[PDB]
């Protein structure tokens, strides 16, 4: 169905331990394709997915340029924000950048994104119009004004609506076999008695792609929120994902409970029952 | 492909 390209940048200052660490990660939906680490020996944008390795020297040259540039801007930006928020040199601080684009099954532009966070909390965000910013405080307002003078939003719009979608459409073509496959979950059920009167029913979904799944517990038609426990979608480590959902049931009432599994790769929504 | 424009101080 729908596809997306996301870029996650992290900058952490380290007082009296040297200059800050920059980490860059690129994704095409749920698959990582690029990596950059300011502490790595290479000091280059490195491939992580097989289908990106085919890109020439010019590609890795530009990608290294852009990340080195952001890396360098953040080193200054950490002290600048430390200034705005009135914080001492002793204390570790984080700057996180999230940006990218969304396209549909037709491969047509849907949305552009640009968000910034200081110490894990919202700092400055580019609105859906890609024409204006949203400052979260008086400090972020100083940046807004600076980025207003710099004509940042206009420049951000040019990339997010243009090159971002061009690159994403290109990645979908080159990595067709892995990026465009819909692997359905291999579903099964387990029973674990916790008492003589109480029992635990667990519903598993394994080896599925994309990570977007739904595991709902039902009892004689109605939904179950009370006594329903879910783990967050975890990576298998081989490009697939895993997830389970459990519910504590009274012994003998196992046939009253059903589990509905929903996935993009699954033709019809699966219903599992003990 | 990463963004290279704009990369201005905040």
């Amino acid at each position, epitope marked *: 169905g729908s596809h997306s390209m996301r870029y996650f940048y992290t900058s952490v200052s380290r007082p009296g331990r040297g200059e800050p660490r920059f980490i860059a990660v690129g994704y095409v939906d749920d698959t990582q394709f690029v990596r950059f680490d300011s502490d790595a020996a290479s000091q280059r944008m490195e491939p992580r997915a097989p289908w990106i390795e085919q890109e020439g020297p010019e590609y890795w040259d530009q990608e290294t*340029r852009n990340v080195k540039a952001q*890396s360098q*801007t953040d*080193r*200054v930006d950490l002290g600048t924000l430390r200034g705005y928020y009135n914080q001492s040199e002793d204390g570790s601080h984080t700057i996180q950048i999230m940006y990218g684009c969304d396209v549909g099954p037709d491969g047509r532009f849907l949305r552009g994104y640009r968000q910034d966070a200081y110490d894990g909390k919202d700092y400055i965000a580019l609105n859906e119009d890609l024409r204006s910013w949203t400052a979260a405080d008086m400090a972020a307002q100083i940046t807004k004004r600076k980025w207003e003078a710099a004509h940042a939003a*206009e420049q951000q719009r040019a990339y997010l609506e243009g090159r971002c979608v061009e690159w994403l459409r290109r990645y979908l073509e080159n990595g067709k076999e892995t990026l465009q496959r819909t692997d359905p979950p291999k579903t099964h059920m387990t029973h674990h008695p916790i008492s003589d009167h109480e029992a635990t029913l667990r519903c598993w979904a394994l080896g599925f792609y994309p990570a977007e799944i739904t595991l709902t517990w039902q009892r004689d038609g109605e939904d179950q929120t009370q006594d329903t426990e879910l783990v967050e979608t975890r990576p298998a480590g081989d490009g697939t994902f895993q997830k389970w959902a459990a519910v504590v049931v009274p012994s003998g009432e196992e046939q009253r409970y059903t589990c509905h599994v929903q996935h993009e790769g699954l033709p019809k929504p699966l219903t599992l029952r003990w | 492909g*990463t963004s290279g*424009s704009p*990369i*201005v101080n905040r």
Partner: T-cell receptor
Amino acid sequence: AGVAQSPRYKIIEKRQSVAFWCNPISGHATLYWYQQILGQGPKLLIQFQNNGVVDDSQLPKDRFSAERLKGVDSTLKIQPAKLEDSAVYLCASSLGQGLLYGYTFGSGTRLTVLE
Amino acid sequence: QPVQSPQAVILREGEDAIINCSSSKALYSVHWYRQKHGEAPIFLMILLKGGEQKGHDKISASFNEKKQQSSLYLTASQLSYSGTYFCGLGDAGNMLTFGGGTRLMVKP
């Protein structure tokens, strides 16, 4: 104020050292160093984003070196200078990167390396 | 990397001059600079996808995304128009790569 560059002209002897200074437009995050041999097109040497290097691939690491330690003014050094190094050393500045931003060049340093 | 054409031009005052700049790969931004006797390159116009058609005083310029070419139009040339014009090129970060140049001579 404009982009400042010291000196305007410099005569050096083949095998001696030389240093070129450059002060960009106050606030400008990006600083560039270009070498223009004769009337030809300026050839990039080094790019700086704030205090650090973005691209130094074009720098002959054997003789050339450049720093911008506090991310304001920059210095380009040649040690040792070859006759081939007789050129105008242009310094450019921009607010950042950049697609809407045009460069602001300084007057440059005219260098003549002599036998 | 960008192909600047022609390398040189001589024309009478009031004649039209058209100088173009071509790229092998897709364009980002096209920079245009003017340079005099040992002077600093002075910025004229910057063209990109936003537009495309720009102007500086009495000189106009084009950006053709499809053709991967940009042109500088010097209509009714004045003695002040000499001498060297440079076409510079994009890069995703705007890192400029200058063309060969164009020595323009306006004879009175």
